[PDB]
Design a protein around this ligand. Structure first.
Ligand SMILES: N#C/N=C1\SCCN1Cc1ccc(Cl)nc1
Ligand SMILES: N#C/N=C1\SCCN1Cc1ccc(Cl)nc1
Ligand SMILES: N#C/N=C1\SCCN1Cc1ccc(Cl)nc1
Ligand SMILES: N#C/N=C1\SCCN1Cc1ccc(Cl)nc1
Ligand SMILES: N#C/N=C1\SCCN1Cc1ccc(Cl)nc1
Lengths: 208, 208, 209, 208, 208
């Protein structure tokens, strides 16, 4: 006998947008997977690439779960009412442009899902973009302030073609995508920051 | 009898901008109709266009109804005070730029109307743009987080000149526009999201 | 005797920035006139132009009035503290960049004056810009959501210098400016929306014989 | 004997940012002085300059005064918690861009000092910019809505080096900067609006 | 004992973001160090550069400390909840483009750390950029409204590779980075303003 309104209110009433949902005291496991949608502006001279991708972000806050037996099992919730991982693109050279409604999806089991479409410039290896082997641009995305003990990242290795959602009208094509997990520490501080290194192998389509 | 100040006050009193106005347990009937007003920047090599259209969006929210017997049966309300469908252009390469005041129109029966002027850039086939056959750019629009069970999108099929309000000073011209109802799915979830496929057909206005 | 501090306070109470001050059942009369200040990037190929102009907007909101007997009859108030017409440029291709402070002038008789300096890009006939007759760019401005029964727009046309405030350093010169009242009923709905057509006639300077 | 916290706490308890601090009924003596920091862009053909400057602005608001005989007599406050003069550049062709933190300095005696660094484009005389005598670009800054009786603008004309803080790396050089006062009346209304006409005599750098 | 929610809750219970936390009556010690990431745009004619760096900002705020005996001694906190130094690059010709989540790291002892990746444009010496000895662009950063007796800025001599995080895909390379502590007094007031001067010696790459 619970409607979507009741569900939302319960989330607001128990969620803390500025507090990380640390269960017991292990880190919060965040899953991050990108699905390239397009590759626009490209410069082999400056090694800069403009790209659009759907950043599928998933985690969980069990303090928000309800009984979906006779109630909706999911609801969209403004991300501002929810705690969202402070993910950041380490080699980005421009703020991310969120092209889609900043709405998240909360599941009755406490699972939270946020998958916005983002356009952002990157500084990566662009050389070879016009060769057969193409170029390989690596994008590192992970928490900015939360280290491993508090946040952990892992690619969603679920099956899905590299360019499953890639634009056909794009001047380029995706050869292969490989989302690996990686760590990043600094000469100052001990704790390491987990990230996902996404390698996008793409090249310029040549007319026959 | 109550006036505008009362109605508006009451609307703001009962509007839940973050909760989908699901009457009973059926999707919200959102009708979408794009009205191309101009076609600016256009590139055939990168398949990219900059368009200005009026996104006529329509839906109902019974919770906002009231007796208009002896009072205004229509008022302008800030879309921030209302729940608004979370639409997105699945093939947009730039966030939508609302060029007009973000005001919606509310009718006593609960029929909400919002139609803003939006300039945006999409990724689409532009080939032939400089021919008599012209180019056909297809733009899909639908909810981003709400599937068919939560939201339905049907093109407000209004038989009208596809260029009824299209600038005459544009370097291009419309041959014909068609808006079909549609949907998409992904490799993660069974739920399908309804959209609208506005197929634009235009070519550069030859200089004769 | 009340001061400006009070006048403002009392105004923030009776003011409803989201409620159009209709008089009984009389549409709100809003006067709109542009005072062109400059003409920048003029692309005769895309029929696009960047214009800077002061938009003098007037209207009355009795619910704002007060006793100017022993108090100032005029004060400057933030536009968010009161209702403001949802004017728009129907043929604008860029958002209206407001260059000046967004404050309006309020008179104890409820008369409201708002005159912002705006930088904006429109789509219009730019052809002929480099000819003796020049080009004639028409800008259509009106309420976006309030139709004729709610908002009535009329240009405060009066024998004035069309280029009175136009920049002398501009690459262009104003041949003539005319503001006409118009109306548009969309083939969807009955209500007719009022607007003002400002036809700007201008050309490049330093032309040949 | 109060402290920073008290001084601020009290400011918001008395400050009215929307109310001009008119003592009795004499206008607010606001002083404006520009300190040109750079000249980034200049168009000889279209008569437009893009410049950077520090806008030293001073006025008084005794309703914010406090006894600093046993506490600081100066504190930095966000201009958002204070009333501020509604100055504008009558010949500005782009909205002002404040590069520095929007903070003012309030002295225990009610004196207020706000000096932001600004990047802005103006329409002015560029002719002669490439000659030994240089060009003269006048910039008129005054209140946008408060006529002479409410606001008065007077430049603090003293002995200061015109290009004292001017960047040595700019492509131009300051020849002289005279800051005169002026009154601007309108063919609409009787009262005039006091303004300050800053004359920036500069030329392009080009020695032997 | 307490959770992260308790920590933050209390932080916002005693934090005065608009008040400088001057321990006793002495200036706040703000440590500032730049960690260069990239050198994008460069114009030797206009003497302007586009730089991306991590501004490692550090200071202490005793009004936020708490017991971490059986609780965490660190949390990520939105900077909107803390007081933050009003730092500003003097020769910056564009406002800072914060590319990362605006979160600060606070320790149980009141230590605060904020390291935002920033993309910004400066007016400095670009001459020789294309020579072997490269160019030396000096960047000056310090408080904007707080003088030496309120805020003191000093570069953490944390020796390390100057191009430790510098992108290897940049068109340029770092030859040397030196960060000296300096001071500046303006012909307005006797109070001096501390700042750090970061000299970045770089050049365009190439092949031997
Ligand atoms: N996979 C998947 N789902 C996708 S890809 C592009 C849009 N969607 C639908 C969606 C699903 C969930 C959320 Cl939080 N946001 C968007
Ligand atoms: N069709 C239609 N209506 C149009 S086209 C240009 C202006 N209008 C009026 C209008 C009517 C309703 C709303 Cl929510 N927004 C705008
Ligand atoms: N005419 C006129 N008035 C002008 S033109 C440029 C500045 N002014 C003063 C003014 C007066 C009132 C308002 Cl709301 N805005 C500006
Ligand atoms: N003169 C002076 N003061 C200057 S020039 C550049 C920075 N400063 C310090 C300052 C002092 C006070 C305020 Cl409100 N703003 C800036
Ligand atoms: N040194 C260091 N730390 C770095 S360099 C790039 C990211 N980090 C982690 C970090 C740590 C703390 C804060 Cl407030 N912000 C960022």
């Amino acid at each position: 006998a619970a409607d979507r309104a009741d569900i939302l209110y319960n989330i607001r009433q128990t969620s803390r947008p500025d507090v990380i949902p640390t269960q017991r005291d292990r880190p919060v496991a965040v899953s991050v997977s990108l699905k390239f949608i397009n590759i626009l502006e490209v410069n082999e001279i400056t090694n800069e690439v403009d790209v659009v991708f759907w950043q599928r972000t998933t985690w969980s806050d069990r303090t928000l779960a309800w009984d979906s037996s006779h109630s909706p099992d999911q609801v969209s919730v403004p991300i501002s009412s929810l705690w969202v991982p402070d993910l950041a693109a380490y080699n980005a050279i421009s703020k991310p442009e969120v092209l889609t409604p900043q709405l998240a999806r909360v599941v009755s089991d406490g699972e939270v899902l946020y998958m916005p479409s983002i356009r952002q410039r990157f500084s990566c290896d662009v050389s070879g973009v016009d060769t057969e082997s193409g170029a390989t641009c690596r994008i590192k995305i992970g928490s900015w302030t939360h280290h491993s003990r508090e946040i952990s990242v892992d690619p969603t290795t679920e099956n899905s073609d590299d360019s499953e959602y890639f634009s056909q009208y794009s001047r380029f094509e995706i050869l292969d995508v490989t989302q690996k997990k990686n760590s990043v520490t600094y000469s100052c501080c001990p704790e390491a920051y987990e990230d996902v290194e996404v390698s996008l192998n793409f090249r310029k389509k040549g007319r026959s």
